[PDB]
Amino acid sequence: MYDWFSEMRKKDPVYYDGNIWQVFSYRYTKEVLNNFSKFSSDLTGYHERLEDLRNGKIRFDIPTRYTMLTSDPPLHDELRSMSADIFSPQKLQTLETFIRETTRSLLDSIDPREDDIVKKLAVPLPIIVISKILGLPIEDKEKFKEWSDLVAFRLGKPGEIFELGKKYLELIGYVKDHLNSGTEVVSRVVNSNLSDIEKLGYIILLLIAGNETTTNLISNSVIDFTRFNLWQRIREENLYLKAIEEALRYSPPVMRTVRKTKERVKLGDQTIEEGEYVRVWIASANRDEEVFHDGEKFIPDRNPNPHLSFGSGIHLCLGAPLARLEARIAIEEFSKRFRHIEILDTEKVPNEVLNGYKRLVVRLKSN
Ligand code: HEM
Numbered sequence: 001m002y003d004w005f006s007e008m009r010k011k012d013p014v015y016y017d018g019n020i021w022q023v024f025s026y027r028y029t030k031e032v033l034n035n036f037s038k039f040s041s042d043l044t045g046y047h048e049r050l051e052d053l054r055n056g057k058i059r060f061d062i063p064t065r066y067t068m069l070t071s072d073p074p075l076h077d078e079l080r081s082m083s084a085d086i087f088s089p090q091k092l093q094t095l096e097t098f099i100r101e102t103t104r105s106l107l108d109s110i111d112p113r114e115d116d117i118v119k120k121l122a123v124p125l126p127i128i129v130i131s132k133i134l135g136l137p138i139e140d141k142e143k144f145k146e147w148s149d150l151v152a153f154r155l156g157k158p159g160e161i162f163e164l165g166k167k168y169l170e171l172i173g174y175v176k177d178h179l180n181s182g183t184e185v186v187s188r189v190v191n192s193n194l195s196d197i198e199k200l201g202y203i204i205l206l207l208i209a210g211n212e213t214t215t216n217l218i219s220n221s222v223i224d225f226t227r228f229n230l231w232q233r234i235r236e237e238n239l240y241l242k243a244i245e246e247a248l249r250y251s252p253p254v255m256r257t258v259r260k261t262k263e264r265v266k267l268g269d270q271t272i273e274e275g276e277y278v279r280v281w282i283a284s285a286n287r288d289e290e291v292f293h294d295g296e297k298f299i300p301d302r303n304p305n306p307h308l309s310f311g312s313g314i315h316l317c318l319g320a321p322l323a324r325l326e327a328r329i330a331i332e333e334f335s336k337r338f339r340h341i342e343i344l345d346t347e348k349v350p351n352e353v354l355n356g357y358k359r360l361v362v363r364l365k366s367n
């Protein structure tokens with residue numbers, strides 16, 4: 001896919017295909033993400049329905065349509081300010097011990113003759129941590145994996161990232177049943193003046209939305225380090241942080257995101273009408289030569305590395321510090337426990353926005 005990115009970057013970085021607008025270069029990507037007053041995140045009509053949600057006129061709707069992810073200021077800032085302290089680096093550092101012991105406990109269950117590190121390490125780790133942070137118990141190990149998988153690009157429903165159905169109704173039920181069992185962040189949302197619909201939305205978003213993406217950051221990291229044979233340079237030169245930032249730049253777990261225009265705007269020398277959808281290719285922008293020298297080479301100590309894999313502007317990923325911390329510990333521990341890694345079989349995640357592996361079968365040499 002990167003092949004096409006390169007050519008669109010050179011010949012056509014702002015491109016209308018007759019359907020929607022697409023952006024490929026770093027400069028125009030960054031400006032669409034930052035300029036919240038011209039490029040809206042309100043894809044589900046959250047602002048337009050806010051009053052009727054709160055006053056009860058809307059009795060039923062899909063809770064995950066009305067979260068901070070699909071809102072603009074001030075509503076976005078108001079929603080986000082309720083949990084921003086919890087996910088900041090300062091507060092998360094508390095958790096470094098829990099993550100490190102959970103990681104090790106997981107590395108134990110691995111069979112080095114042959115195992116799937118997606119199934120034994122990459123999938124469980126984010127689920128266990130977010131559950132700790134939120135105070136919600138993992139009743140069924142299996143249904144958390146399933147619910148985590150409900151996250152997906154839905155065609156025709158922009159800004160919707162959850163697949164619906166009976167699995168979804170279960171998620172909602174489970175959340176109602178544990179409302180009053182949560183930690184600090186959950187209490188704040190519950191006691192707030194949000195509608196019940198928004199509360200469910202808020203919690204489900206935090207519980208679920210970040211699992212698969214983190215799983216993918218871990219897997220992509222393992223893959224990239226192996227294929228370019230960097231495992232021992234990364235370790236002897238202690239490059240975990242900058243290496244993982246490079247995995248993020250090179251193999252982003254989220255490939256693209258979308259905005260809608262609030263008004264006629266001029267992006268480069270194109271004119272986008274008011275009301276158009278603008279698809280922003282994070283993955284292409286992460287390799288724009290104008291910003292990254294040798295953009296198609298993986299460079300584990302790269303610096304500076306201002307990639308957009310967590311986005312930019314007011315929606316910059318709430319979970320970015322958490323994701324960096326989980327990834328880094330997991331790599332480190334893995335890296336000290338095994339020294340030779342052979343990749344036997346892979347299965348990519350087959351869909352288009354999310355970029356990772358469903359299976360990653362390896363054989364390992366342990367120390
Ligand atoms: C490698 C892991 C992750 C990646 C690559 C990633 C990527 C992103 C991106 C690109 C956005 C921007 C959305 C947009 O502007 O349209 C975003 C926003 C967001 N992410 Fe993540 N994410 C990751 C992990 C997490 C985790 C662990 C959490 C929470 C537990 C999380 C929760 C959120 C939330 C709540 C937003 C919306 C924040 C706002 O709108 O102000 N993500 N993420």
Ligand SMILES: Brc1ccc(-c2c[nH]cn2)cc1
Binds near residue numbers: 153161319354
């Ligand atoms: Br589709 C799609 C699925 C998940 C995300 C996300 C960003 N941060 C945590 N999860 C974004 C888009």
